[PDB]
C-alpha cells in the first residue's frame, strides 16, 4: 500500500501557545507561561469571560505596512505534531469526542496495515493563515513527501478535508509536473470548497457562534475576522455568478464583485486587504495535475445567501441550497471542469446525505479510500 499524507481543514489540528504578555484583558488571564499549552482545542478556554483571554491570544494582528499578520505582543503560537497523526486525530488532547476529527479514519488505516508516524503522516498547519503566510509549511510538506517516497519505495496518496484541499491545490499548482508524476500517486479530496463558500459572508458580517451558543456571535466575530483564511474562502467568480447576491439588507445588496464595499460597510477594512493578499493564490482554472478523486456531499441544506433586517450586528435569515451543510454543491463543478484540462484521471463521487464533518468517519467514505489504497 502506498504512503499517505493527511491534510486537515480549518480548525483541523491542535495549536499551542506560549505567553509573556505585557498586559492582559482580565486579571483571570495568564500573563506568562513557562512552556507551551494547548490553545486549540481546550473547551475550558471558551467559557464566558475566559473566552476574552483566548480571543486575545489566538487573534491575528494585521499589519498594513508589511501586509502580513503577526501574533499579539508576547504571544507565540506553534503547530505540534507535523509528520505525526495525533494532532489531527484529536483536536482536544484530553481525547474527548468533541475533538475527534481524523481518529476514525486513522483507526481504519491502521487496521489495514498502516503505521502512525511512518507510512501515514499528518501535515498540520496554522489554519488561521492562508497559503501566502505558510511558505515554510509547503517546504516541509515537499520534503516529507520526498522522504516518504524514499523510505517506503513509492509515490504518496494525499488525503485532504475541507480547506485542506485548497492548501493541497496551492501546493500542487506550484510543483513541476515531473515532480508530481514521480512523488504523488493520487489526491483524494474530501469536501473541497473549490471556489469558496457562501457562509463566510455571515461569519465576517455578524459572527458565527453556532458551535459555542453560550458565547455571543459578536464576541467570537473578533477572532473569526482576524483569521486570514476566512476572507480567503469568500466566493470566487470561477464557481459563482458575479451577479449572485450573497447578502441582502434593507438598503444595499452584496455580490462577489462588492467585497470592497462589504468590508467598508461592516467596519473591517483589513478584510479587504486580506482578500487582495489571497484572492490570486490559487490559479482559477489550473488543475492539480494528479489523479484526483473528488468526493462531495449532497442532500444537506447548505447556506446560500443571507437576509439582514439589521446589518451587520444582528443574525440574518438564511436561504439554503444543496451541498454538505458547509460546502455549496457548485464547488463540485470545479472538479468537473478539470477533467478536460489534465491528462490524469478525475473521478467524481457523490455522497448523498453525507454531512461535511461526518464524512470523515463515514463507512462509505472509508470503503472508497480502502479501494484507492489497497486496490480491487
Ligand atoms: C509592522 O511591520 C513593520 C514592517 O515589518 C514593522 O516595522 C512594524 O514594527 C510592525 N508593526 C507592529 C505594530 O508590530
Ligand atoms: C474574477 O475575479 C477576480 C478576482 O478574484 C477579478 O480580478 C476578475 O476581474 C474577475 N473576472 C471577471 C468578473 O470576469
Ligand atoms: C437587492 O436585490 C433584490 C433582488 O435580488 C431586490 O429585490 C432588492 O430591491 C435589492 N436591494 C437593494 C437595497 O437594492
Ligand atoms: C454516510 O455516507 C453515505 C453516502 O453518502 C450516506 O448515505 C449515509 O447516510 C452516511 N452515514 C451517516 C451516518 O450519515
Ligand atoms: Cl491517472
Curated annotation (Swiss-Prot):
UniProt keyword list: Acyltransferase, Disulfide bond, Fatty acid metabolism, Glycoprotein, Hydrolase, Lipid degradation, Lipid metabolism, Lysosome, Membrane, Metal-binding, Secreted, Signal, Transferase, Zinc
Effect of residue 49 to S: No effect on phospholipase activity. Strongly decreases transacylase activity and association with membranes
Compartments, as annotated in UniProt: Lysosome; Secreted; Membrane
Intrachain disulfide bonds: 29-53
Activity control note: Inhibited by zinc ions at neutral pH. Zinc ions in plasma may keep the enzyme from hydrolyzing inappropriate substrates.
PTM characteristics: N-glycosylated. N-glycosylation is important for maturation of the enzyme and normal subcellular location.
One Pfam family it belongs to: LCAT
Main localization, broad class: other
Catalytic residues as annotated in Swiss-Prot or TrEMBL: 162 (acyl-ester intermediate), 324 (charge relay system), 356 (charge relay system)
Effect of residue 199 to A: No effect on phospholipase activity. Abolishes transacylase activity. Has no effect on association with membranes
Record family assignment: Belongs to the AB hydrolase superfamily. Lipase family.
This protein's name: Lysosomal phospholipase A and acyltransferase
